[PDB]
Amino acid sequence: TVTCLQMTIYHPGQQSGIFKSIRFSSKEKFPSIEVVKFGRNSNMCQYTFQDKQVSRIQFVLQPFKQFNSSVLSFEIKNMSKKTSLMVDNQELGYLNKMDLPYKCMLRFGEYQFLLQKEDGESVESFETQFIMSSRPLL
Amino acid sequence: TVTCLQMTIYHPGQQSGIFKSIRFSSKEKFPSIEVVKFGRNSNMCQYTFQDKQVSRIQFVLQPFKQFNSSVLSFEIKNMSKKTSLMVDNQELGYLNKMDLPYKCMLRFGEYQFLLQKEDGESVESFETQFIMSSRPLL
């Protein structure tokens, strides 16, 4: 099995088309070499948001392995200078990083990201899946 | 002033042409967005080695900021499934990571890397410098 990071995302103005370029429901597979970027720039970020309130690159997610663990984990790093990044009740400034648990909440601007990791056997590949939440998450 | 990572490298086959692609003595600037990659593949790594005992991508270096401290630090992560990576006295398997102190020793295969962080005040970019050592470092 491939480890998939399910991301349930919400924004108060999500119907405006800020997720116009995001492909939901389906799974997309990445190699373990990849650093997945989120932001406003389509040339830099794999996942783009049609929103001027989001930095050119908002933050990045990359897979890693905890010591003597045979499965993937994910580390996050804030790439935004003006906007902070809330990993539950821990605030991340510019170029701050943190190892994500199995279940955590992401907040930046007025975006809400529910993050749940479902593990697999693989360590050389991971998948992502986006689900748009109709109601707020908090 | 920019934070520079000075890397002193040693390998007994350094005269054979392993380092014919590495520009020594110079400084090279990198944005804080970029993740530095070392390995055998010239299309996947910024700094490449001709040795066939080096994996496609040996390991990665990326900048970040520890909490409170507004100066750049560096995280290393082994990208080699086969060859383990030694940071001072700690072994790193595939996708194992570790944050580097100002001065530490890297070791993979027959390679030896001396890493020293020369702090600058800029957090928007960093620089690298390669120094060759006639004598082994350990």
Token code pair at residue A18: 């800020």
* Number of residues that make up chain B: 138
Does B64 contact A32 at a Cβ distance shorter than 8 Å? no
A67 and B32: CB-CB below 8 Å? no
Whose CA is closest to B115, among B126, B101, B127, B125?
A: B101
DSSP B13: T
Laid out side by side, the sheet with A36-39 consists of A47-48, A36-39, A59-65, A72-78, A97-99
DSSP E strands: which ranges in chain A?
3-10, 27-31, 36-39, 47-48, 59-65, 72-78, 85-87, 90-92, 97-99, 103-108, 111-118, 125-132
DSSP states of A65-77: E-TT-SSEEEEEE
Residues of chain A in Cβ contact (below 8 Å) with chain B: 32-33, 35, 44, 57, 63-67, 72, 75, 77, 79, 93-97, 123-124
> Bridge-partner residues for B127, per DSSP?
B4, B29
Q: Resolution for this model in angstroms, one decimal place?
A: 2.9
Q: Hey, what are A81's tokens?
A: 């200078």
Q: Which of A63, A64, A95 sits opposite B63 (nearest CB)?
A: A95
Sheet containing strand A103-108, edge to edge, reads: A27-31, A125-132, A3-10, A111-118, A103-108, A85-87, A90-92
Q: Which residue of A35, A65, A96 is in closest CB contact with B93?
A: A65
Cα A129 vs. chain centroid, distance in angstroms?
10
Which chain A residue has its CA at the smallest distance from B72's CA?
A: A95
Please give the DSSP secondary-structure letter assigned to residue B96.
Answer: B
CB B32 within 8 A of CB B123: yes
- In the block, tokens 């005269």 appear at B15
Q: How big is the CA angle at A136 (ends A134 and A137), to the nearest 5 degrees?
A: 115
Residues comprising chain A, all counted: 138
Which technique was the structure solved with, according to the deposited record? X-ray
What would the two tokens of residue A22 be?
């995001």
The rounded distance, in Å, linking the Cα atoms of B47 and B44 is 9
Please report how many Cα atoms fall inside a 13 Å half-sphere around the Cα of residue B5, on the Cβ side.
27
State how far residue B15 is from chain A, nearest Cα, in angstroms. 31
Q: How far apart are CA B119 and CA B2, in angstroms?
A: 7
